[PDB]
């Protein structure tokens, strides 16, 4: 069946080096060219380079010459990509993909699952969780601000899962090497403050689990 | 380097209609162009090879055409599982280059944003910081302007925006806008205003609070 299984995610500091694996199965490995492609958060795709695994020949995107080094181990049927001089601009998802034999008449017909690379000098930091209350016949919006944590991800649920429906958890943004996000929730007017809304924030990397009950803040 | 231009970064459609995604090469690339599909959270998957050939297993509603510079991927009777990103690529000469992508989205009736402003919490104020948050929720189409005013002056410094993709369930968009200040700058001002301008109305939606009333 054509199948490419990539190595696990990588979270390292700038200036270091990393080596990502891509194990092929289900075809004659030696002569099919293997491409490498990256995807930065929210962006499109950029081609890095290609390797002829049997011959060992390579061709590089000029932007990646001397940053990327592509190799192949015919024994294990594994392709390798090494990235040096890592900066935070290199944080991205890296894909290997199979193309046709010897030369690319068909490009990237099977893709590996991708490898996430995160390049950061920051250290594991738990999030500060702040309530977003609006004060007090339709529908009221509450929020949970999840600020200054590293690394991704956090998960926000509302009322230990009880609320699910009117939930927006926004994408995080990187401000000064730390991540921030907010999660909105809309519950019936006769549910709040009448009853109880609590946000549950979990940040596994710091071993954190916090609940913030939303209390009114009648401004005016 | 060859540039592959997908002139349309977003394309709305209804299930069962016909869509045509263009891709123009910067120079002649013969028929060495490929088309890929990428669903959210997934690897790309190959669709069309050598400009017009379907890869094995890909449904027949997908059709690739073109030669020279103007290439096209036409989907007849678009289905819901077709809502995704589509990238062209040229492999005529190195480096291989991708188009910058077309996101295919479901069309729906216009919806104005529900705008909510929230003062910074006293929890945060005791840490020397003050984040003012504004939600702009459940609107359609995607385009929207957000403007903050502190004591009537347009404030652009300290504002970080965040957008969701189209909602799996009701097809709308959402947006948070967050003004992050030191406590001292925050307590230096009184009136904080979040202003949204969306096509559903000539008037901005205006939400505000006065700090001396919290």
């Amino acid at each position: 069946q054509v199948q490419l299984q990539q190595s696990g995610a990588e979270l390292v500091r700038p200036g270091t080096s990393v080596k990502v694996s891509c194990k092929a199965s289900g075809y004659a490995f030696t002569n099919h060219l293997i491409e490498w492609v990256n995807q930065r958060p929210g962006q499109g795709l950029e081609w890095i380079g290609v390797i002829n695994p049997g011959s060992g020949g390579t061709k590089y995107n000029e932007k990646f010459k001397g940053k990327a080094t592509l190799t192949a181990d015919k024994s294990s049927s594994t392709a390798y990509m090494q990235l040096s001089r890592l900066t935070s601009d290199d944080s991205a998802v890296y894909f290997c993909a199979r193309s046709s034999e010897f030369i690319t008449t068909v490009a990237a017909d099977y893709w590996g699952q991708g490898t996430t690379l995160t390049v950061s000098s920051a250290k594991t930091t738990p999030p500060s969780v702040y309530p977003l209350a609006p004060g007090s016949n339709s529908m009221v919006t509450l929020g949970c601000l999840v600020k200054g944590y590293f690394p991704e991800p956090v998960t926000v649920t509302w009322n230990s899962g009880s609320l699910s429906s009117g939930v927006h958890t926004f994408p995080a943004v990187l401000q000064s090497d730390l991540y921030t996000l907010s999660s909105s929730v809309t519950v019936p007017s006769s549910t709040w403050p009448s009853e109880t809304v609590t946000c549950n924030v979990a940040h596994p990397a710091s071993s954190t689990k916090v609940d913030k009950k939303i209390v009114p803040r009648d401004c005016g | 380097d060859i540039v592959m231009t997908q002139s349309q970064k977003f394309m709305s459609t209804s299930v069962g209609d016909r869509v045509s995604i263009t891709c123009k090469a910067s120079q002649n690339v013969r028929t060495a162009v490929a088309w890929y599909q990428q669903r959210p959270g997934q690897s790309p998957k190959a669709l069309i090879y050598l400009a017009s050939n379907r890869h094995t297993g890909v449904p027949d509603r997908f059709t690739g055409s073109g030669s020279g510079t103007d290439f096209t991927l036409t989907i007849t009777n678009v289905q819901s599982e077709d809502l995704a990103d589509y990238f062209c690529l040229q492999h005529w000469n190195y480096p291989l280059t991708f188009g910058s992508g077309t996101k295919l989205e479901i069309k729906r009736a216009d919806a104005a944003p529900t705008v909510s402003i929230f003062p910074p919490s006293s929890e945060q104020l005791t840490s020397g910081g003050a984040s003012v948050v504004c939600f702009l929720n459940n609107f359609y189409p995607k385009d929207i302007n957000v403007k903050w005013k502190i004591d009537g002056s347009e404030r652009q410094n300290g504002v970080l925006n965040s957008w969701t993709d189209q909602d799996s369930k009701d097809s709308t968009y959402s947006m948070s806008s967050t003004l992050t200040l030191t406590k001292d700058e925050y307590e230096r001002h009184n009136s904080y205003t979040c202003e949204a301008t969306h096509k559903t109305s000539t008037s901005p939606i205006v939400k505000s609070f006065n700090r001396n009333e919290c």
């Binding site: 011959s55 020949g57 061709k59 030369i103 008449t105 | 005529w92």
Partner: peptide
């Protein structure tokens, strides 16, 4: 074009 990576463009130099 078999040990080293060639490009379909580089092959044009063999046509008519």
């Amino acid at each position: 074009c078999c040990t080293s990576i060639c490009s379909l463009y580089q092959l044009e130099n063999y046509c008519n």
